[PDB]
């Protein structure tokens with residue numbers, strides 16, 4: 001899963017069998033680290049009309 | 051059912067009959083209009099090309 005974003009700790013629990021989660025946009029919105037099984041949110045990098 | 055068009059009312063017409071109001075009600079009929087759409091703007095290259 002290649003992409004760009006702001007990784008943070010996340011509060012919402014995955015069930016043990018889940019590997020990652022999605023926005024309604026189908027774009028990923030949270031992930032498990034495959035080495036240490038903690039859940040990270042993937043917030044978008046900040047943007048706006050200059 | 052076949053819908054009602056409202057109650058029927060044969061108006062009590064004649065060449066010499068008038069109905070004049072003895073009394074009134076003031077009434078405060080609310081009317082609602084939209085005015086501003088939500089101000090969307092889209093970065094079409096971030097939408098299309100990520």
Ligand SMILES: *[C@@H]1O[C@H](CO)[C@@H](O[C@@H]2O[C@H](CO)[C@@H](O)[C@H](O)[C@H]2NC(C)=O)[C@H](O)[C@H]1NC(C)=O
Pocket residue numbers: 072073074075
């Ligand atoms: C005109 O209509 C109003 C109601 O819309 C009447 O006012 C009421 O009068 C009774 C006594 O007759 C009171 O007990 C009510 O409290 C009044 N209602 C309100 C909202 O104040 C009024 O009397 C009528 N007047 C005539 C001359 O027909």
Ligand SMILES: *[C@@H]1O[C@H](CO)[C@@H](O)[C@H](O)[C@H]1NC(C)=O
Pocket residue numbers: 035036
């Ligand atoms: C793999 O990563 C975890 C921590 O993410 C670590 O505990 C483990 O020791 C690593 N594997 C090896 C062979 O060191």
